From a paper:
[name] is an enzyme from [name] that is specialized in the removal of the 3′-phosphate and other 3′-lesions, which are potential blocks for DNA repair. [name] is a highly active DNA 3′-phosphatase, and although it is from the class II AP family it lacks AP endonuclease activity.
In addition, a catalytic point mutant ([name]) was used to obtain the structures of both the substrate and product DNA complexes in the presence of Mg2+, the essential metal ion cofactor. The [name] mutation [name] is analogous to the D210N mutation which inactivates human APEX1 (37–39), and our biochemical analysis demonstrates that [name] completely abolishes activity in [name]. The position of divalent metal ion cofactors was determined for the inactive [name] in complex with substrate DNA and Mg2+, and for the product DNA complex with Mn2+. In the [name] structure with the 3′-phosphate substrate, we see that the scissile phosphoester bond that links the 3′-oxygen (O1P) to the phosphate is bound within the active site of [name], and is oriented towards the mutated catalytic residue [name]. Recognition of the 3′-phosphate is mediated via hydrogen bonds between the 3′-phosphate and neighbouring residues N148, H247, N7 and Y105. The substrate bound structure of [name] has a Mg2+ ion coordinated between the well-conserved D146, N7, N9 and E34, which are positioned on the leaving group side of the scissile phosphate bond. Therefore, the Mg2+ ion is well positioned to stabilize the increased negative charge of the pentavalent transition state and the displacement of negative charge onto the 3′-oxygen during the dissociative phase of the reaction. That the [name] mutation completely abolishes activity of the enzyme indicates a critical role for this residue in catalysis.
Author numbering: 0 to 256
Write the structure that this text describes.
DNA sequence: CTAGCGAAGCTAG
């Protein structure tokens, strides 16, 4: 059995208490985090080790930041994308936990389709595809998860017409998401829940979480042997409902053999 | 609207 949660925390300094409450109550075997927004030396290692967790992370000042936190030791830790070796933004970290290759990604947002950050998003997703393919040549059990900043289909958008060919929802971005699906990966949530709105992000503005209008952009993609044992996927809107919350909700997947 | 940086108003999401 194995339980893995992904969360875009948006500043790990701010929401560290909520991370520790997440690791205290029905804790997962693996928790990965995006948007730490703290430098490499500022990670709260001691506070998480006190509770019995191993941590491998990649951080920079102010932006980005990824982390893997697990009960067992994360082995063979890789930083970044080989096809993009000069990108200073800390967005990818991979490690093998309990024989399962975890690839944690905080994907480029893109801002706008006419923004330079969208070209950056394009190249970054290409490099990600190459890295994930090469990693899949070596690991039967693989999970590529995190904040993809891409709503796969219209059912992942509270409103497909105003988001028509807008950032997160454009046909190009969905073709990138499909490029990662074509390597042999399964959208685990859509396997367990083929129908319905399972939004994972709600804009801070306009009380959009209260209106329950958001996007499903936080995903857990799994290899074939992982989908064979895939049993459940849930969006922790309760964490999203907390005071001073992240705009993303945690997402958990549950497997067993 | 929130968070960072840093002292105000951009950048980023
Ligand atoms: Mg955010
Ligand atoms: Mg459409």
């Amino acid at each position: 059995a194995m339980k893995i949660t992904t969360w875009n925390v948006n500043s790990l300094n701010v929401r560290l208490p909520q991370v520790q409450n997440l690791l205290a109550d029905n804790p997962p075997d693996i928790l990965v985090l995006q948007e730490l927004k703290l430098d490499q030396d500022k990670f709260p290692a001691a506070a998480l080790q006190m509770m019995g967790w191993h941590c491998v992370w990649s951080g920079q000042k102010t932006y980005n930041g990824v982390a893997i936190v697990s009960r067992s030791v994360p082995q063979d830790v890789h930083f970044g994308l080989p096809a993009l070796p000069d990108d200073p933004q800390r967005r990818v970290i991979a490690a093998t936990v309990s024989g399962v290759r975890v690839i944690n990604v905080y994907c480029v947002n893109g801002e706008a389709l006419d923004s330079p950050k969208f070209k950056y998003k394009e190249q970054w997703f290409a490099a990600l595809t190459e890295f994930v393919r090469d990693e899949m040549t070596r690991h039967g059990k693989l999970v590529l998860l995190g904040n993809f900043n891409i709503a796969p289909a219209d059912a992942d958008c509270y409103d497909p017409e105003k988001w028509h060919e807008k950032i997160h929802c454009s046909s190009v971005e969905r073709q990138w998401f499909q490029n990662l699906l074509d390597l042999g990966l399964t959208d685990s949530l859509r396997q367990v829940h083929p129908e319905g709105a399972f939004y994972t992000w709600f804009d801070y503005r306009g009380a959009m979480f209260q209106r329950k209008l958001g996007l499903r952009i936080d995903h857990i993609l799994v290899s074939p042997a992982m989908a064979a044992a895939l049993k459940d996927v849930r969006v922790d809107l309760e964490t999203r409902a907390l005071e001073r919350p992240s705009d993303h909700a945690p997402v958990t997947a549950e497997f067993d053999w």
